[PDB]
Protein backbone atom coordinates (compact mmCIF):
# COMPACT_ATOMS: atom_id res chain seq x y z
CA UNK A 1 0.00 0.00 0.00
CA UNK A 2 0.99 3.64 -0.54
CA UNK A 3 1.57 6.22 -3.31
CA UNK A 4 3.86 4.17 -5.57
CA UNK A 5 2.19 0.81 -4.99
CA UNK A 6 -0.39 1.85 -7.58
CA UNK A 7 2.50 2.06 -10.05
CA UNK A 8 3.96 -1.26 -8.88
CA UNK A 9 0.74 -3.10 -9.75
CA UNK A 10 0.80 -1.31 -13.09
CA UNK A 11 4.09 -2.92 -14.15
CA UNK A 12 3.27 -6.46 -12.94
CA UNK A 13 -0.51 -6.86 -12.84
CA UNK A 14 -2.86 -4.22 -14.27
CA UNK A 15 -5.92 -6.32 -13.48
CA UNK A 16 -6.20 -4.11 -10.41
CA UNK A 17 -6.23 -1.01 -12.64
CA UNK A 18 -9.69 0.44 -13.11
CA UNK A 19 -10.42 3.15 -15.63
CA UNK A 20 -10.72 5.43 -12.63
CA UNK A 21 -7.42 4.11 -11.35
CA UNK A 22 -5.69 5.14 -14.57
CA UNK A 23 -7.54 8.47 -14.54
CA UNK A 24 -6.92 9.26 -10.88
CA UNK A 25 -3.19 8.81 -11.28
CA UNK A 26 -0.94 11.86 -11.31
CA UNK A 27 2.04 10.70 -13.35
CA UNK A 28 4.16 13.77 -12.63
CA UNK A 29 3.75 13.56 -8.86
CA UNK A 30 4.70 9.89 -9.19
CA UNK A 31 7.92 10.22 -11.16
CA UNK A 32 8.71 12.67 -8.40
CA UNK A 33 8.19 10.10 -5.65
CA UNK A 34 10.45 7.89 -7.75
CA UNK A 35 13.27 10.38 -8.27
CA UNK A 36 13.38 11.56 -4.66
CA UNK A 37 12.39 8.34 -2.87
CA UNK A 38 12.07 7.64 0.85
CA UNK A 39 15.03 5.18 0.69
CA UNK A 40 17.30 4.98 -2.38
CA UNK A 41 16.08 2.05 -4.40
CA UNK A 42 17.75 -0.90 -6.07
CA UNK A 43 18.33 -0.48 -9.79
CA UNK A 44 15.94 -3.39 -10.27
CA UNK A 45 12.94 -1.78 -8.59
CA UNK A 46 13.57 1.54 -10.33
CA UNK A 47 13.32 -0.28 -13.63
CA UNK A 48 9.98 -1.79 -12.68
CA UNK A 49 8.37 1.45 -11.53
CA UNK A 50 9.59 3.05 -14.75
CA UNK A 51 7.50 0.53 -16.65
CA UNK A 52 4.43 0.99 -14.49
CA UNK A 53 4.44 4.74 -15.04
CA UNK A 54 4.62 4.21 -18.80
CA UNK A 55 1.85 1.61 -18.56
CA UNK A 56 -0.55 4.10 -16.93
CA UNK A 57 0.64 6.77 -19.34
CA UNK A 58 -0.20 4.46 -22.23
CA UNK A 59 -3.65 3.58 -20.90
CA UNK A 60 -4.49 7.26 -20.28
CA UNK A 61 -3.55 7.79 -23.92
CA UNK A 62 -5.60 4.79 -25.05
CA UNK A 63 -8.71 5.99 -23.17
CA UNK A 64 -8.42 9.58 -24.41
CA UNK A 65 -8.09 8.35 -27.98
CA UNK A 66 -11.20 6.21 -27.55
CA UNK A 67 -13.06 9.21 -26.19
CA UNK A 68 -11.98 11.69 -28.87
CA UNK A 69 -13.12 9.19 -31.49
CA UNK A 70 -16.53 8.74 -29.89
CA UNK A 71 -16.83 12.50 -29.42
CA UNK A 72 -15.99 13.28 -33.05
CA UNK A 73 -18.28 10.64 -34.55
CA UNK A 74 -20.85 12.05 -32.13
CA UNK A 75 -20.60 15.40 -33.93
CA UNK A 76 -20.92 14.60 -37.63
CA UNK A 77 -23.59 12.30 -36.28
CA UNK A 78 -25.54 15.40 -35.19
CA UNK A 79 -25.09 17.21 -38.49
CA UNK A 80 -27.99 15.01 -39.65
CA UNK B 1 2.42 -14.16 2.87
CA UNK B 2 3.35 -17.79 3.41
CA UNK B 3 2.59 -21.27 2.13
CA UNK B 4 -0.42 -22.36 4.16
CA UNK B 5 -0.76 -25.83 2.64
CA UNK B 6 0.49 -27.98 -0.25
CA UNK B 7 -1.53 -30.64 -2.09
CA UNK B 8 0.00 -33.13 -4.53
CA UNK B 9 -1.42 -35.87 -6.70
CA UNK B 10 0.30 -37.89 -9.41
CA UNK B 11 3.55 -35.92 -9.18
CA UNK B 12 6.72 -38.05 -9.28
CA UNK B 13 6.65 -40.40 -6.31
CA UNK B 14 3.41 -39.04 -4.74
CA UNK B 15 0.99 -41.20 -6.69
CA UNK B 16 -2.10 -40.99 -4.51
CA UNK B 17 -3.38 -37.61 -3.37
CA UNK B 18 -1.38 -35.97 -0.60
CA UNK B 19 -2.89 -33.19 1.51
CA UNK B 20 0.17 -32.04 3.43
CA UNK B 21 -0.89 -30.82 6.87
CA UNK B 22 -0.84 -27.01 6.92
CA UNK B 23 2.59 -25.51 7.39
CA UNK B 24 3.73 -23.50 10.33
CA UNK B 25 4.35 -19.89 9.41
CA UNK B 26 7.80 -20.40 10.98
CA UNK B 27 10.25 -23.25 10.20
CA UNK B 28 8.89 -26.61 9.05
CA UNK B 29 11.45 -29.39 8.75
CA UNK B 30 10.95 -32.54 6.69
CA UNK B 31 12.75 -35.77 7.50
CA UNK B 32 12.78 -39.17 5.94
CA UNK B 33 15.21 -41.75 4.64
CA UNK B 34 17.02 -41.30 1.35
CA UNK B 35 14.85 -41.86 -1.71
CA UNK B 36 11.63 -41.48 0.29
CA UNK B 37 10.33 -38.32 -1.42
CA UNK B 38 12.07 -35.29 0.06
CA UNK B 39 13.64 -33.71 -3.05
CA UNK B 40 10.50 -34.85 -4.90
CA UNK B 41 8.45 -32.72 -2.52
CA UNK B 42 10.50 -29.59 -3.14
CA UNK B 43 10.21 -30.29 -6.84
CA UNK B 44 6.41 -30.33 -6.54
CA UNK B 45 6.61 -26.80 -5.10
CA UNK B 46 9.33 -25.65 -7.48
CA UNK B 47 6.91 -27.05 -10.04
CA UNK B 48 4.29 -24.49 -9.10
CA UNK B 49 6.52 -21.47 -8.37
CA UNK B 50 9.96 -21.62 -9.97
CA UNK B 51 10.86 -19.94 -13.20
CA UNK B 52 13.00 -22.88 -14.30
CA UNK B 53 9.88 -25.06 -14.45
CA UNK B 54 7.60 -22.62 -16.28
CA UNK B 55 8.83 -23.80 -19.70
CA UNK B 56 8.76 -27.57 -20.15
CA UNK B 57 9.41 -29.57 -23.27
CA UNK B 58 6.82 -32.36 -23.18
CA UNK B 59 9.54 -34.94 -22.42
CA UNK B 60 10.42 -32.83 -19.38
CA UNK B 61 6.69 -32.56 -18.62
CA UNK B 62 6.05 -36.31 -18.74
CA UNK B 63 9.08 -36.81 -16.48
CA UNK B 64 6.96 -35.34 -13.70
CA UNK B 65 4.17 -37.92 -13.70
CA UNK B 66 4.31 -41.04 -11.55
CA UNK B 67 5.54 -44.18 -13.25
CA UNK B 68 4.99 -47.06 -10.84
CA UNK B 69 2.92 -50.16 -10.24
CA UNK B 70 -0.77 -49.48 -10.63
CA UNK B 71 -2.90 -48.00 -13.41
CA UNK B 72 -0.97 -45.74 -15.73
CA UNK B 73 -0.74 -42.35 -14.04
CA UNK B 74 -2.26 -39.90 -16.46
CA UNK B 75 -2.22 -36.43 -14.83
CA UNK B 76 -0.61 -34.65 -11.92
CA UNK B 77 -1.33 -31.42 -10.08
CA UNK B 78 0.21 -29.45 -7.26
CA UNK B 79 -2.03 -26.89 -5.55
CA UNK B 80 -0.18 -24.37 -3.39
CA UNK B 81 -2.48 -22.49 -1.01
CA UNK B 82 -0.94 -19.24 0.19
CA UNK B 83 -2.01 -17.27 3.18
CA UNK B 84 -2.43 -13.70 1.94
CA UNK B 85 -3.40 -12.15 5.25
CA UNK B 86 -1.01 -9.24 4.59
CA UNK B 87 -2.47 -8.68 1.09
CA UNK B 88 1.01 -9.14 -0.38
CA UNK B 89 -0.40 -10.98 -3.32
CA UNK B 90 -2.60 -8.46 -5.24
CA UNK B 91 -5.76 -10.47 -4.64
CA UNK B 92 -8.50 -9.53 -2.18
CA UNK B 93 -8.65 -12.89 -0.48
CA UNK B 94 -7.03 -14.06 2.76
CA UNK B 95 -6.11 -17.35 1.02
CA UNK B 96 -4.97 -17.75 -2.56
CA UNK B 97 -5.03 -21.16 -4.28
CA UNK B 98 -2.44 -21.47 -7.01
CA UNK B 99 -2.46 -24.82 -8.74
CA UNK B 100 -0.74 -26.24 -11.79
CA UNK B 101 -2.08 -29.34 -13.48
CA UNK B 102 -0.22 -31.44 -15.94
CA UNK B 103 -0.83 -34.13 -18.50
CA UNK B 104 0.25 -35.53 -21.83
CA UNK B 105 -1.09 -32.45 -23.66
CA UNK B 106 -2.15 -30.08 -20.87
CA UNK B 107 -0.06 -27.75 -18.73
CA UNK B 108 -2.51 -25.39 -17.05
CA UNK B 109 -2.40 -23.04 -14.07
CA UNK B 110 -5.45 -22.32 -11.94
CA UNK B 111 -5.82 -19.28 -9.70
CA UNK B 112 -8.59 -19.49 -7.14
CA UNK B 113 -9.94 -22.17 -9.51
CA UNK B 114 -9.81 -19.91 -12.59
CA UNK B 115 -7.52 -20.46 -15.55
CA UNK B 116 -4.50 -18.20 -15.88
CA UNK B 117 -1.48 -18.05 -18.10
CA UNK B 118 2.01 -19.04 -17.09
CA UNK B 119 2.81 -15.43 -17.89
CA UNK B 120 0.12 -14.37 -15.42
CA UNK B 121 1.59 -16.54 -12.67
CA UNK B 122 5.01 -15.11 -13.46
CA UNK B 123 3.66 -11.61 -13.18
CA UNK B 124 1.68 -12.49 -10.06
CA UNK B 125 4.75 -13.86 -8.30
CA UNK B 126 7.03 -11.07 -9.53
CA UNK B 127 4.47 -8.67 -8.10
CA UNK B 128 4.66 -10.23 -4.63
CA UNK B 129 8.39 -9.58 -4.85
CA UNK B 130 9.60 -12.91 -6.16
CA UNK B 131 12.13 -11.73 -8.75
CA UNK B 132 13.25 -14.15 -11.43
CA UNK B 133 16.53 -12.19 -11.14
CA UNK B 134 17.11 -14.07 -7.92
CA UNK B 135 17.97 -17.79 -7.91
CA UNK B 136 18.02 -18.21 -4.13
CA UNK B 137 14.44 -18.46 -3.00
CA UNK B 138 15.05 -22.20 -3.28
CA UNK B 139 18.49 -23.44 -2.25
CA UNK B 140 19.69 -26.94 -3.07
CA UNK B 141 23.11 -28.46 -2.58
CA UNK B 142 23.52 -27.92 -6.32
CA UNK B 143 23.47 -24.15 -6.07
CA UNK B 144 25.81 -24.02 -3.08
CA UNK B 145 28.72 -25.60 -5.00
CA UNK B 146 27.84 -23.78 -8.21
CA UNK B 147 28.47 -20.71 -6.07
CA UNK B 148 31.54 -22.03 -4.22
CA UNK B 149 33.24 -23.45 -7.33
CA UNK B 150 32.59 -20.34 -9.39
CA UNK B 151 34.96 -17.94 -11.16
CA UNK B 152 35.14 -14.43 -9.78
CA UNK B 153 33.99 -13.41 -13.27
CA UNK B 154 30.72 -15.35 -13.24
CA UNK B 155 30.21 -14.10 -9.67
CA UNK B 156 30.14 -10.57 -11.11
CA UNK B 157 27.58 -11.43 -13.82
CA UNK B 158 25.44 -12.77 -10.98
CA UNK B 159 25.36 -9.60 -8.87
CA UNK B 160 24.85 -7.32 -11.87
CA UNK B 161 21.79 -9.43 -12.70
CA UNK B 162 20.54 -9.39 -9.12
CA UNK B 163 21.30 -5.70 -8.60
CA UNK B 164 19.26 -4.85 -11.68
CA UNK B 165 21.29 -4.33 -14.87
CA UNK B 166 19.43 -7.09 -16.70
CA UNK B 167 15.89 -6.38 -15.50
CA UNK B 168 16.60 -2.66 -15.85
CA UNK B 169 17.93 -2.86 -19.42
CA UNK B 170 14.94 -5.15 -20.00
CA UNK B 171 12.21 -2.83 -18.70
CA UNK B 172 13.99 0.33 -19.92
CA UNK B 173 13.92 -1.16 -23.39
CA UNK B 174 10.39 -2.46 -22.82
CA UNK B 175 9.14 1.00 -21.86
CA UNK B 176 10.36 2.76 -25.01
CA UNK B 177 8.49 0.28 -27.22
CA UNK B 178 5.34 1.52 -25.48
CA UNK B 179 6.03 5.23 -25.78
CA UNK B 180 6.64 4.99 -29.52
CA UNK B 181 3.38 3.06 -29.84
CA UNK B 182 1.77 5.87 -27.81
CA UNK B 183 2.91 8.68 -30.12
CA UNK B 184 0.76 7.29 -32.92
CA UNK B 185 -2.16 7.51 -30.51
CA UNK B 186 -1.22 11.00 -29.28
CA UNK B 187 -1.04 12.37 -32.80
CA UNK B 188 -4.23 10.55 -33.77
CA UNK B 189 -5.71 12.32 -30.73
CA UNK B 190 -4.41 15.82 -31.53
CA UNK B 191 -5.71 15.38 -35.07
CA UNK B 192 -9.22 14.65 -33.80
CA UNK B 193 -9.29 17.70 -31.56
CA UNK B 194 -8.43 19.81 -34.58
CA UNK B 195 -11.17 18.19 -36.68
CA UNK B 196 -13.65 18.69 -33.83
CA UNK B 197 -12.47 22.28 -33.41
CA UNK B 198 -13.44 22.93 -37.03
CA UNK B 199 -16.98 21.56 -36.61
CA UNK B 200 -17.33 23.86 -33.62
CA UNK B 201 -16.04 26.67 -35.81
CA UNK B 202 -18.53 25.69 -38.51
CA UNK B 203 -21.45 25.58 -36.07
CA UNK B 204 -20.41 28.94 -34.62
CA UNK B 205 -20.95 30.46 -38.04
CA UNK B 206 -24.18 28.70 -38.89
CA UNK B 207 -25.46 29.61 -35.41
CA UNK B 208 -24.54 33.23 -36.16
CA UNK B 209 -26.33 33.33 -39.53
CA UNK B 210 -29.67 32.13 -38.20
CA UNK B 211 -29.41 34.54 -35.27
CA UNK B 212 -28.68 37.31 -37.80
CA UNK B 213 -31.54 36.30 -40.14
CA UNK B 214 -26.79 21.10 -40.65
CA UNK B 215 -29.33 19.59 -38.26
CA UNK B 216 -30.99 21.34 -35.32
CA UNK B 217 -29.43 18.69 -33.09
CA UNK B 218 -25.90 19.96 -33.67
CA UNK B 219 -27.06 23.53 -33.15
CA UNK B 220 -29.02 22.48 -30.09
CA UNK B 221 -25.99 20.57 -28.72
CA UNK B 222 -23.39 23.18 -29.68
CA UNK B 223 -22.88 24.27 -26.06
CA UNK B 224 -22.34 20.71 -24.85
CA UNK B 225 -19.76 19.93 -27.54
CA UNK B 226 -17.82 23.08 -26.76
CA UNK B 227 -17.82 22.14 -23.07
CA UNK B 228 -16.74 18.66 -24.10
CA UNK B 229 -13.79 19.76 -26.20
CA UNK B 230 -12.29 21.62 -23.24
CA UNK B 231 -12.79 18.49 -21.13
CA UNK B 232 -10.64 16.49 -23.56
CA UNK B 233 -8.10 19.28 -23.92
CA UNK B 234 -7.37 19.20 -20.22
CA UNK B 235 -6.76 15.44 -20.55
CA UNK B 236 -4.48 15.96 -23.54
CA UNK B 237 -2.55 18.46 -21.45
CA UNK B 238 -2.19 15.70 -18.85
CA UNK B 239 -0.43 13.51 -21.42
CA UNK B 240 1.80 16.23 -22.84
CA UNK B 241 2.73 17.02 -19.24
CA UNK B 242 3.16 13.35 -18.40
CA UNK B 243 5.32 12.65 -21.45
CA UNK B 244 7.78 15.26 -20.25
CA UNK B 245 8.08 13.88 -16.76
CA UNK B 246 8.81 10.36 -18.16
CA UNK B 247 11.84 11.58 -20.07
CA UNK B 248 12.88 13.23 -16.81
CA UNK B 249 12.59 9.79 -15.23
CA UNK B 250 14.43 7.84 -17.94
CA UNK B 251 17.40 10.17 -17.60
CA UNK B 252 17.60 10.10 -13.81
CA UNK B 253 17.68 6.31 -14.08
CA UNK B 254 20.42 6.15 -16.71
CA UNK B 255 22.43 8.27 -14.23
CA UNK B 256 21.64 6.92 -10.76
CA UNK B 257 22.27 3.63 -12.66
CA UNK B 258 25.91 2.97 -11.80
CA UNK B 259 25.48 4.56 -8.38
CA UNK B 260 22.68 2.06 -7.77
CA UNK B 261 24.60 -0.97 -9.03
CA UNK B 262 27.52 -0.26 -6.72
CA UNK B 263 24.92 0.75 -4.12
CA UNK B 264 23.81 -2.87 -4.25
CA UNK B 265 27.35 -4.32 -4.35
CA UNK B 266 28.43 -2.49 -1.18
CA UNK B 267 25.37 -3.76 0.67
CA UNK B 268 25.93 -7.44 -0.08
CA UNK B 269 29.56 -7.11 1.01
CA UNK B 270 28.40 -5.47 4.24
CA UNK B 271 25.92 -8.30 4.81
CA UNK B 272 28.50 -10.92 3.78
CA UNK B 273 30.72 -10.17 6.76
CA UNK B 274 27.84 -9.71 9.22
CA UNK B 275 26.53 -13.17 8.36
CA UNK B 276 29.91 -14.91 8.39
CA UNK B 277 31.18 -13.07 11.47
CA UNK B 278 28.01 -14.37 13.16
CA UNK B 279 28.20 -18.04 12.08
CA UNK B 280 31.93 -18.49 12.62
CA UNK B 281 32.41 -16.19 15.63
CA UNK B 282 35.81 -14.55 15.66
CA UNK B 283 36.14 -15.22 11.95
CA UNK B 284 36.12 -12.45 9.39
CA UNK B 285 35.57 -12.30 5.64
CA UNK B 286 34.98 -9.72 2.92
CA UNK B 287 34.48 -9.46 -0.84
CA UNK B 288 36.78 -7.97 -3.45
CA UNK B 289 36.63 -6.71 -7.05
CA UNK B 290 39.04 -7.88 -9.76
CA UNK B 291 40.19 -5.55 -12.56
CA UNK B 292 35.16 -4.19 -13.75
CA UNK B 293 35.91 -7.89 -14.37
CA UNK B 294 35.08 -10.13 -11.41
CA UNK B 295 34.18 -10.50 -7.74
CA UNK B 296 36.20 -12.68 -5.38
CA UNK B 297 36.31 -13.67 -1.73
CA UNK B 298 38.92 -13.49 1.04
CA UNK B 299 38.17 -15.21 4.34
CA UNK B 300 39.84 -15.40 7.76
CA UNK B 301 38.48 -17.89 10.30
CA UNK B 302 40.23 -15.89 13.06
CA UNK B 303 43.56 -11.60 9.76
CA UNK B 304 45.33 -14.29 7.70
CA UNK B 305 42.89 -14.50 4.81
CA UNK B 306 43.06 -16.88 1.85
CA UNK B 307 41.62 -16.80 -1.69
CA UNK B 308 38.42 -18.70 -2.58
CA UNK B 309 40.24 -21.49 -4.43
CA UNK B 310 42.75 -21.77 -1.54
CA UNK B 311 40.10 -23.13 0.88
CA UNK B 312 39.01 -26.47 2.30
CA UNK B 313 36.04 -28.77 1.68
CA UNK B 314 33.18 -27.95 4.03
CA UNK B 315 34.78 -24.51 4.14
CA UNK B 316 34.24 -23.49 0.52
CA UNK B 317 30.64 -24.66 0.97
CA UNK B 318 29.94 -22.75 4.16
CA UNK B 319 31.55 -19.59 2.76
CA UNK B 320 29.43 -19.77 -0.39
CA UNK B 321 26.44 -20.42 1.87
CA UNK B 322 27.01 -17.19 3.77
CA UNK B 323 27.31 -15.37 0.45
CA UNK B 324 23.83 -16.61 -0.38
CA UNK B 325 22.38 -15.77 3.04
CA UNK B 326 23.81 -12.27 2.53
CA UNK B 327 22.21 -11.92 -0.90
CA UNK B 328 19.01 -12.95 0.86
CA UNK B 329 19.21 -10.32 3.62
CA UNK B 330 19.74 -7.87 0.72
CA UNK B 331 16.38 -8.75 -0.95
CA UNK B 332 14.28 -10.90 1.41
CA UNK B 333 11.19 -12.89 0.57
CA UNK B 334 8.21 -14.25 2.52
CA UNK B 335 9.41 -17.87 2.62
CA UNK B 336 12.33 -20.05 1.54
CA UNK B 337 12.92 -23.67 0.54
CA UNK B 338 16.12 -25.48 1.55
CA UNK B 339 16.78 -28.96 0.12
CA UNK B 340 19.66 -30.41 2.18
CA UNK B 341 21.98 -27.44 2.56
CA UNK B 342 23.68 -28.49 5.82
CA UNK B 343 25.15 -31.67 4.29
CA UNK B 344 28.50 -30.28 3.24
CA UNK B 345 29.61 -28.92 6.65
CA UNK B 346 30.67 -30.35 9.98
CA UNK B 347 28.39 -30.30 12.99
CA UNK B 348 29.97 -27.30 14.69
CA UNK B 349 28.97 -25.17 11.71
CA UNK B 350 25.81 -27.21 11.10
CA UNK B 351 24.54 -25.86 14.42
CA UNK B 352 25.79 -22.36 13.62
CA UNK B 353 23.42 -22.29 10.63
CA UNK B 354 20.51 -23.89 12.52
CA UNK B 355 21.06 -21.20 15.12
CA UNK B 356 20.75 -18.46 12.51
CA UNK B 357 17.53 -19.84 11.13
CA UNK B 358 15.89 -19.65 14.56
CA UNK B 359 16.36 -15.89 14.30
CA UNK B 360 15.39 -15.71 10.65
CA UNK B 361 12.18 -17.72 10.94
CA UNK B 362 10.52 -15.19 13.26
CA UNK B 363 10.08 -13.07 10.15
CA UNK B 364 9.86 -15.51 7.22
CA UNK B 365 8.74 -19.07 6.60
CA UNK B 366 11.20 -21.87 5.95
CA UNK B 367 10.54 -25.30 4.54
CA UNK B 368 13.67 -27.47 4.83
CA UNK B 369 14.98 -31.05 4.65
CA UNK B 370 17.94 -32.58 6.41
CA UNK B 371 19.65 -35.73 7.61
CA UNK B 372 21.50 -34.15 10.54
CA UNK B 373 19.89 -33.30 13.88
CA UNK B 374 21.42 -29.80 14.15
CA UNK B 375 18.64 -28.07 12.29
CA UNK B 376 15.95 -29.99 14.12
CA UNK B 377 16.63 -27.52 16.93
CA UNK B 378 15.60 -24.76 14.52
CA UNK B 379 12.23 -26.30 13.63
CA UNK B 380 8.67 -25.57 14.67
CA UNK B 381 6.78 -28.33 12.82
CA UNK B 382 8.08 -31.79 11.87
CA UNK B 383 7.19 -33.86 8.80
CA UNK B 384 8.17 -37.44 8.06
CA UNK B 385 8.40 -38.70 4.49
CA UNK B 386 7.83 -42.44 4.10
CA UNK B 387 8.33 -44.53 0.97
CA UNK B 388 6.10 -47.57 0.92
CA UNK B 389 5.15 -49.71 -2.09
CA UNK B 390 6.92 -47.39 -4.54
CA UNK B 391 4.92 -44.29 -3.45
CA UNK B 392 5.68 -41.57 -0.88
CA UNK B 393 3.60 -40.41 2.06
CA UNK B 394 4.05 -37.28 4.16
CA UNK B 395 2.90 -37.08 7.75
CA UNK B 396 3.19 -34.79 10.74
CA UNK B 397 5.46 -36.24 13.40
CA UNK B 398 6.71 -35.05 16.77
CA UNK B 399 10.23 -33.76 17.32
CA UNK B 400 11.03 -36.87 19.33
CA UNK B 401 10.24 -39.01 16.29
CA UNK B 402 12.21 -36.52 14.20
CA UNK B 403 15.43 -37.38 16.02
CA UNK B 404 14.62 -40.89 14.83
CA UNK B 405 15.00 -40.55 11.02
CA UNK B 406 18.43 -38.87 11.42
N1 LIG C 1 8.72 -39.51 -12.05
C1 LIG C 1 8.72 -40.43 -10.95
N2 LIG C 1 7.67 -41.20 -10.72
C2 LIG C 1 7.69 -42.03 -9.69
N3 LIG C 1 8.75 -42.11 -8.89
C3 LIG C 1 9.84 -41.36 -9.07
C4 LIG C 1 9.85 -40.48 -10.12
N4 LIG C 1 11.03 -39.86 -10.09
C5 LIG C 1 11.73 -40.32 -9.06
N5 LIG C 1 11.02 -41.24 -8.43
C6 LIG C 1 11.50 -41.98 -7.28
O1 LIG C 1 11.05 -41.57 -6.13
C7 LIG C 1 12.25 -41.46 -5.22
C8 LIG C 1 12.74 -40.15 -5.23
O2 LIG C 1 12.53 -39.51 -4.03
P1 LIG C 1 13.62 -38.30 -3.86
O3 LIG C 1 12.97 -37.13 -3.14
O4 LIG C 1 14.19 -37.91 -5.20
O5 LIG C 1 14.87 -38.79 -2.91
P2 LIG C 1 15.06 -38.22 -1.38
O6 LIG C 1 13.93 -38.79 -0.56
O7 LIG C 1 16.44 -38.66 -0.94
O8 LIG C 1 15.04 -36.72 -1.37
C9 LIG C 1 13.31 -42.31 -6.00
O9 LIG C 1 12.91 -43.77 -5.95
C10 LIG C 1 13.13 -41.85 -7.14
O10 LIG C 1 13.94 -42.57 -8.17
MG1 LIG D 1 16.99 -35.94 -2.18
Please give a structural write-up.
The PDB classes it as nuclear protein. The entry lists the keywords 3D genome organization, Chromatin, Cohesin, ATPase activity, ATPase cycle, nuclear protein. It forms a dimeric assembly. The complex is a heterodimer of chains A (80) and B (406). Chain A has one domain. In chain A, 74% of the residues lie in helices and 0% in strands. Chain A contains 4 helices and no strands. Chain A starts with a helix and ends with a helix. In chain B, the strands form 3 sheets. Chain B has a 6-stranded antiparallel β-sheet. A 6-stranded mixed β-sheet of chain B has the order 8-11-12-3-13-14. In chain B, strands 9-10 form a two-stranded antiparallel sheet. Among the domains of chain B are: 149 residues, 3-Layer(aba) Sandwich (Rossmann fold), CATH 3.40.50; 87 residues. Chain B is of the alpha/beta class and 406 residues long. The two termini of chain B are 31 Å apart. The structure holds adenosine-5'-diphosphate and magnesium ion (MG).
The global form of chain B is globular
Report Rg of chain B: 29 Å
Using the coordinates shown, work out and report the CATH topology of the domain at 1-130 and 379-397 in chain B: Rossmann fold
What is the helix fraction of residues of chain B, given as a range?
A: 40-55%
Quaternary form: heterodimer
Q: Helix and strand string of chain B, N-terminal first?
A: EEEHHEEEEHEHHHHEEHEHEEEH
Q: In angstroms, what separates the terminal alpha carbons of chain B? A: 31 Å
How widely separated are the two ends of chain A? Answer: 51 Å
Fraction of residues in β-strands of chain B: 15-25%
Backbone structural class of chain A: mainly alpha
What string gives the helices and strands of chain A in order?
HHHH
The largest interface is:
A-B, 46 and 63 residues
Beta-strand fraction estimate of chain A = under 5%
CATH superfamily of the domain at 1-130 and 379-397 in chain B: P-loop containing nucleotide triphosphate hydrolases
Amino acid sequence: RGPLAKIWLAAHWDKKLTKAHVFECNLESSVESIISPKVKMALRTSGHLLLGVVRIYHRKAKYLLADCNEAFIKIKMAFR
Amino acid sequence: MYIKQVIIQGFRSYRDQTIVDPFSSKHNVIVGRNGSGKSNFFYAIQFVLSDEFSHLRPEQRLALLHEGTGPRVISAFVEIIFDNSDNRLPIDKEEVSLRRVIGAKKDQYFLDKKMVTKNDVMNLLESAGFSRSNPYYIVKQGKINQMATAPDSQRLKLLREVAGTRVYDERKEESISLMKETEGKREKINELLKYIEERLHTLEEEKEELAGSVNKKALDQFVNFSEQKEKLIKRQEELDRGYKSIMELMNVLELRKYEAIQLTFKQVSKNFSEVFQKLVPGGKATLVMKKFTGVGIRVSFTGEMREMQQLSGGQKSLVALALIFAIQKCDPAPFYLFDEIDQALDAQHRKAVSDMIMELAVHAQFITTTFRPELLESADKFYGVKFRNKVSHIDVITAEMAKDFV
